[PDB]
Design an enzyme around this catalytic site. Structure first.
Site, short mmCIF file in Angstrom:
data_model
loop_
_atom_site.label_atom_id
_atom_site.label_comp_id
_atom_site.label_asym_id
_atom_site.label_seq_id
_atom_site.Cartn_x
_atom_site.Cartn_y
_atom_site.Cartn_z
N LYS A 147 0.83 -1.20 0.00
CA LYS A 147 0.00 0.00 0.00
C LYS A 147 0.86 1.25 0.00
CE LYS A 147 -3.41 -2.38 2.60
NZ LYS A 147 -3.31 -2.65 4.07
N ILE B 282 -1.20 8.03 -0.40
CA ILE B 282 -1.73 8.80 -1.51
C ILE B 282 -1.15 10.23 -1.56
CG2 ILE B 282 -3.75 9.77 -0.32
CD1 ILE B 282 -5.24 8.77 -3.09
N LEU C 265 5.68 13.47 0.03
CA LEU C 265 6.56 14.63 0.15
C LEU C 265 7.54 14.64 -1.03
CD1 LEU C 265 7.46 16.92 2.22
CD2 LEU C 265 9.38 15.37 2.66
N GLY C 266 7.52 15.71 -1.81
CA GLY C 266 8.50 15.86 -2.87
C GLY C 266 9.78 16.49 -2.35
N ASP D 266 9.36 11.13 -1.84
CA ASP D 266 9.71 10.94 -3.25
C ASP D 266 11.06 11.59 -3.53
OD1 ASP D 266 9.55 12.50 -6.10
OD2 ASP D 266 8.48 10.60 -6.30
N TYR E 11 18.23 15.03 -8.20
CA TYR E 11 17.98 16.15 -7.30
C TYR E 11 19.22 16.49 -6.48
CZ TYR E 11 13.06 14.83 -8.18
OH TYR E 11 11.89 14.43 -8.79
N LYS F 97 14.47 7.38 -8.27
CA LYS F 97 14.34 7.30 -9.71
C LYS F 97 15.70 7.13 -10.38
CE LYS F 97 10.57 10.74 -9.37
NZ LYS F 97 11.07 11.45 -8.17
N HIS G 279 13.17 7.35 -14.59
CA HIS G 279 12.83 8.78 -14.53
C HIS G 279 12.20 9.29 -15.83
CE1 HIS G 279 12.81 12.64 -12.67
NE2 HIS G 279 13.90 12.48 -11.93
#
Length: 315
Positions: free
Chosen positions: A11, A14, A17-18, A43, A48, A77, A110
């Site tokens: 699970k 939904i 946090l970016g 995430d 990054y 990613k 990505h």
């Protein structure tokens, strides 16, 4: 309705946090605050360049025992320069080392576009054009499947793939693992109705990023009110005693999408979490859906001539 079931049986929260555009000097504090507020899905991505700082926050909060690792849903990613079959494993292991984790809950390709391997994120021509890899999507998918078998990641998925590129993977001879999620740009100006209908029918969970679009719209005058100050959206917000940002985060959630907001301020992190105590009505949803202009902000224009460029297709 605060987690969605993936096709591996796990699970996925939904709301995520970016850490996109969160600077390394600020991101450790941002993630600590987020976990205290109640975020469990975070995430990340190698590109990054802040994964190490994200990792410090995670195992600080694990030491404090405010959360256990099985409660966390961590995703990262694979960057484009690592699409070569032989390089995928090391890219994954680097991210795990940075995050200081034993496994990832989800690992995404990505972009469908592979670049020439090397130190550069965007390898260049002498004329400054991005140099493509000769790699196939199916080859790098084989390498991703191996990561699930070795227990390094719990699920694998894709990002910014059009439906033909998804179908290509679904029809891979000897396919072992289907994509668990497709992470795409989705906001009121690009409602992605066709692509999400396709994905959901195949059992693939869709994650929306940039849910507020971009402030700089090509059709708008500088005096035109933004999405956050649009009168009809303000009316919906007023109706629910919510902010307009909160209405626009809830919007994807009620399409059964996972949503990663831009989370670059402490205020936004706190504000964006308060989206679970209300529901938008049918009329609200039809109104918010009516803003669509099929306007894509993240179009990776530098790569339009790449064979695996996703956005020439309709969806």
């Amino acid at each position: 309705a605060s987690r969605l079931l993936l096709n591996n049986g796990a699970k996925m929260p939904i709301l995520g946090l970016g850490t996109w555009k969160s600077p390394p000097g600020q991101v450790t504090e941002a993630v600590k605050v987020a976990i205290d507020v109640g975020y469990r899905h975070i995430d990340c991505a190698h590109v990054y360049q802040n994964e190490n700082e994200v990792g410090v926050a995670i195992q600080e909060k694990l030491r404090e025992q405010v959360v256990k690792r099985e409660e966390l849903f961590i995703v990262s990613k694979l960057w484009c320069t690592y699409h070569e079959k032989g390089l995928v494993k090391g890219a994954c292991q680097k991210t795990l080392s940075d995050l200081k984790l034993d496994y990832l809950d989800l690992y995404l390709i990505h972009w469908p576009t592979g670049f020439k391997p090397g130190k550069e994120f965007f390898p260049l021509d002498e004329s400054g054009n991005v140099v493509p890899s000769d790699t196939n999507i199916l080859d790098t998918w084989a390498a991703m499947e191996e990561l699930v078998d070795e227990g390094l990641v719990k699920a694998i998925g894709i990002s910014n793939f059009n439906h033909l590129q998804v179908e290509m993977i679904l029809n891979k001879p000897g396919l072992k693992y289907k994509p668990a999620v497709n992470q795409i740009e989705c906001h009121p100006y690009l409602t992605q109705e066709k692509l999400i209908q396709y994905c959901q029918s195949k059992g693939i969970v869709v994650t929306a990023y940039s849910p507020l679009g971009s402030p700089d719209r090509p059709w708008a005058k500088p005096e035109d009110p933004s999405l956050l100050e649009d009168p009809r959206i303000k009316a919906i917000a007023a109706k629910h005693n919510k902010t307009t940002a909160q209405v626009l985060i809830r919007f994807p959630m009620q399409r059964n999408l996972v949503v990663i907001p831009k989370s670059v301020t402490p205020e936004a992190i706190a504000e964006n979490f308060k989206v679970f105590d209300f529901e938008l009505s049918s009329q609200d949803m039809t109104t918010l859906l009516s803003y669509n202009r099929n306007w894509r902000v993240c179009a990776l224009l530098s790569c339009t001539s790449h064979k695996d460029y996703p956005f020439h297709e309709e969806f």
